[PDB]
Amino acid sequence: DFTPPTVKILQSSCDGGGHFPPTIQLLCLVSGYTPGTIQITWLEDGQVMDVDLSTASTTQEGELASTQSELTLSQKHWLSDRTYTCQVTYQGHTFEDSTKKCACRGSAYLSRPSPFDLFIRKSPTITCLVVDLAPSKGTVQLTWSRASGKPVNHSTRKEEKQRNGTLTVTSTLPVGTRDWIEGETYQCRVTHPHLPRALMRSTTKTSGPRAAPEVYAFATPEWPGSRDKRTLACLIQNFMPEDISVQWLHNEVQLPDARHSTTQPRKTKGSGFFVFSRLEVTRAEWEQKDEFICRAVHEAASPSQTVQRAVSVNP
Ligand SMILES: *[C@@H]1O[C@H](CO)[C@@H](O[C@@H]2O[C@H](CO)[C@@H](O[C@@H]3O[C@H](CO[C@H]4O[C@H](CO)[C@@H](O)[C@H](O[C@H]5O[C@H](CO)[C@@H](O)[C@H](O)[C@@H]5O)[C@@H]4O)[C@@H](O)[C@H](O)[C@@H]3O)[C@H](O)[C@H]2NC(C)=O)[C@H](O)[C@H]1NC(C)=O
């Protein structure tokens, strides 16, 4: 019945080279809300900014209103690391959103759960990988959190000393199948002593369109010299989003992942991604049962998040 106001801040984009414009415009949006008394105030480090610095406007279309306020800042003030708060008092109730310049020296990566773990195994996990760090006295702490503030499970901790003298800190967090699918956002804070401030990475399910993959499996003809082995190739394409899991099945058995090589998802010329999978098979396997299945596990695949194609060595 009632629609509460949603506060979001949009900022001036950087150019093609990643350079800041001469002035930064912060645009506060109070979009799609039930009409009522509204006030927008801008704060610079918790202090009320002068009315002349910002310009607001309210527009009513249908049963809902939409208010916006634009604040103009100099490049000096934005680069000074000052925090800018947009304070919206709607129907006497305060709603706030804050922003500052986005937070060199060589990195952290946060992955989404694999479609196989989410849909087949039904035990998804997210991995925070922290790389390119120099050997220095003091541990590297990785902390997991949810946007909802709900509790997280206990994670794993793998530390590896690489050949080049660098260290990799791997944390694997188990997530809920129901939680991920319902759009939970998982964050991983990297508290490092050599950094001044935390390196935070966040992950959540795909936003845009979903398109099921097309699976095609091929068997190479006999090549002179390789009479007792064959190569099976699989083209999995036109899927959206890029998140895909590939498996090869022979004789009602799922072959080990070590048996095959799958490429990384690359864009097609039109819409969607593509992957290739390569499996080397022996005469003993095809003479046992001449059917090898290439299976793709994808979120857009119906009815069970799976699409597959069989291939036989001999016609
Ligand atoms: C010192 O040496 C180390 C050697 O380890 C160098 O560290 C590597 O640095 C690069 C660049 O920073 C890292 O690459 C990133 O990896 C991100 C994470 O990707 C992994 O995890 C995914 C989820 O589990 C997984 O899918 C992915 O695998 C993919 O590639 C496989 C290739 O064989 C392929 O078979 C799979 O199908 C799949 O497609 C990865 O395992 C990724 O998101 C980034 O885009 C980026 O590529 C390496 O991970 C680092 N190595 C390790 C072990 O962590 C370091 O840079 C060297 N220092 C210097 C100065 O050169």
Q: How many helical (H) and strand (E) elements, i.e. helices and strands, does the chain have?
A: 4, 24
Resolution in units of Å: 2.6
SS (H, E, C) 174-229: ECCHHHHHCCCCEEEEEECCCCCCCEEEEECCCCCCCECCEEEEEECCCCCCCCCE
Give the gyration radius of the chain's Cα atoms.
Answer: 26
Ligand 1 site-directed mutation target among 132, 274, 277, most atoms within 8 Å of CB: 132
The CATH classification of domain 103-205, taken from the options 2.40.160.100, 3.40.50.2300, 2.60.40.10, 1.10.10.350: 2.60.40.10
Q: Who contacts 44 (Cβ-Cβ below 8 Å, separation ≥6)? A: 77, 82, 83, 84
3-state helix, strand, coil in the chain (%, to 5): 10, 50, 45
| Class (C level, CATH) for 206-315 | mainly beta
Q: Where are the domains of the chain?
A: 1-102, 103-205, 206-315
Nearest CA to ligand 1 atom 41: 129
Please classify residue 59 by burial: count the beta carbons closer than 10 Å to its beta carbon, then call 0-12 exposed, 13-18 middle and 19+ buried.
exposed
**1-102 and 103-205: identical CATH topology:** yes
Token couple for 22: 């001469």
What is the fold of 1-102? Answer: Immunoglobulin-like (2.60.40)
8-state DSSP, 285: H
CA nearest ligand 1 atom 36, residue: 264
Site to substitute for ligand 1 among 105, 107, 109, most atoms within 8 A of C-beta: 109
Atom 15 in ligand 1: which residue has the minimum CA distance?
109
In ligand 1, which atom is closest to the CA atom of 263? Answer: 37
Give every strand in the sheet of 306-311, ordered side by side. Answer: 253-254, 245-250, 292-297, 306-311
Measured between alpha carbons, how far is 209 from 240 in angstroms, rounded to an integer? 6
- The per-residue b/e assignment along 160-179, b for 16 or more CB within 10 angstroms, e otherwise, is eeeeeeebebbbebbbeeeb
Exp. method = X-ray
Q: From ligand 1's centre to the CA of 170, what distance in Å? A: 11
Nearest CA to ligand 1 atom 53: 168
Give, for ligand 1, the residue of 129, 156, 266 to mutate: max count of ligand atoms closer than 8 Å to Cβ: 129
* 109 CA from centroid of ligand 1 (Å): 9
Q: Which residues line ligand 1 (CB under 6 A)?
A: 107, 109, 111, 127, 129, 131-132, 162, 164, 166, 168, 262, 264
